[PDB]
Amino acid sequence: RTRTVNLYGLPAANPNNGNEYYEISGRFSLISLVPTNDDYQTPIMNSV
Amino acid sequence: RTRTVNLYGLPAANPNNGNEYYEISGRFSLISLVPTNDDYQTPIMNSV
């Protein structure tokens, strides 16, 4: 009803289309460096 | 039961004649002046 047709792209008007949420699924890796002053005794919940 | 008889016309007393509507059919030619573009005036990355 206006002078703009055959653009392409997602405008900011209603990006969600009323969907409750846009969804992604995947797997992420991570190699943390929790400290250690002794072999047998490794921590959880890094809080330093 | 009155003077005026044999007159040509159509009075307003009962024009519907018990009909719901008077219908007419035809063709409809319009030469309006649209605002529509010609696929120009649109950004250079106008595409999938």
Yes or no: say if A46 and A34 are a contact pair by the CB < 8 Å rule.
Answer: yes
In whole angstroms, give the CA distance from residue A12 to residue A4: 15
Burial of B42 (0-12, 13-18, 19+ CB in 10 A): middle
Q: Please name the amino acid found at residue B35.
A: P
What is the nearest CA distance from A21 to chain B, expressed in angstroms? Answer: 24
Give, as one character, the DSSP assignment of residue A16: T
Q: Which residue is it, tokens 């040509």?
A: B8
Interface contact flag, A5 B36, Cβ < 8 Å: yes
Q: Scanning every residue of chain A, which has its alpha carbon at the shortest distance from the alpha carbon of B44?
A: A7
Residues on chain A bordering chain B, Cβ-to-Cβ distance under 8 angstroms: 2-8
The structure was resolved to a resolution in Å of 3.5
Yes or no: say if A6 and B46 are a contact pair by the CB < 8 Å rule.
Answer: yes
Interface contact flag, B35 A5, Cβ < 8 Å: no
